């Protein structure tokens, strides 16, 4: 037995962009999941197929902690059955998701005066992601009938766009750090 390295995930200094969402694969370790839920740091703590307090009493093999940054009004999309740019083109949960979605405001860390543009999301994609699919390609998106030939222009858009995180953004446009815990149930 040994405690899960959840500190490395939740307390990581830098977070991935949502299109290149980071995944941490952890063996069947032990963790006081009840203490996580009762942490005031977490403003979003939503579990599906299982209760936060009964997480330790689960039969699974690997737990995955996926984590990334999105904007506040996009946290609603990190849930089974959702549509929109994030759920369709960046990070998709399955309908039968078993696990938890944890999120918190990171304006004090991921916003910069004059804008922090390091965080990106996929704005254009021909089709929806399958659940737990990751797409990091950067091919020019062809929105018209003429081929782009790797040159941006009219009807030829780079498929990723930067968030513009400023401290004075409204809360729907402030950065949120998200961790998704899923369980390979037996």
């Amino acid at each position, epitope marked *: 037995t040994n405690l899960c390295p959840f500190g490395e995930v939740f307390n990581a200094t830098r977070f991935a962009s949502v299109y290149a969402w980071n995944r941490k694969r952890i063996s069947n370790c032990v963790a006081d999941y*009840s203490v996580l*839920y*009762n942490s*005031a740091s977490f*403003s*979003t*703590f*939503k*579990c*599906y197929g*299982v*209760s*936060p*307090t*009964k997480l330790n009493d689960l039969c699974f093999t690997n737990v995955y902690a996926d984590s990334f940054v999105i904007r*506040g*009004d996009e*946290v*609603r999309q990190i*849930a089974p059955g959702q549509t929109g740019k994030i759920a369709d083109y960046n990070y998709k949960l399955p309908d039968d998701f078993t696990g*938890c979605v944890i999120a918190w405001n990171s304006n004090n860390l991921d916003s910069k005066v004059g804008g922090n543009y390091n965080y990106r999301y996929r704005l254009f994609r021909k089709s929806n992601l399958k659940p737990f699919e990751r797409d990091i390609s950067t091919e020019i998106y062809q929105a018209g009938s003429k081929p782009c030939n790797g040159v941006e222009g009219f009807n030829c858009y780079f498929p990723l766009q930067s968030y513009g995180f400023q401290p004075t953004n409204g809360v729907g446009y402030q950065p949120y750090r998200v961790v998704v815990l899923s369980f390979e149930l037996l």
Partner: nanobody
Amino acid sequence: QVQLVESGGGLVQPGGSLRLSCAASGFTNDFYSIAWFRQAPGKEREGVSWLSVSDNTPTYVDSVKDRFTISRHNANNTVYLQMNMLKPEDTAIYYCAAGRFAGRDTWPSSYDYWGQGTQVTVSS
């Protein structure tokens, strides 16, 4: 169908108490979560207390931490919010919300079921 019956509001003096209640009906199982939002004059809906039903775990904001108490009676399928040491800041329209998940969220767009709130006023 899902429906949140809400009652228990009224006028009270600063320092008094008030017991709000949220009677849920239409849930097949206990796998849902209850939240209490309040909407001050001109302000947005803001959660103050939460209760995941399937594990019976409460959560509170720091401002109402030692003053509010949320709990559930399983017989009548009713959630209660015991508000002690009420302050003029607590004057708002209080709503209870429910979502098809086990947990809590500060974003109102995560709860699909609401009750048309009861008025709570604290003055002297």
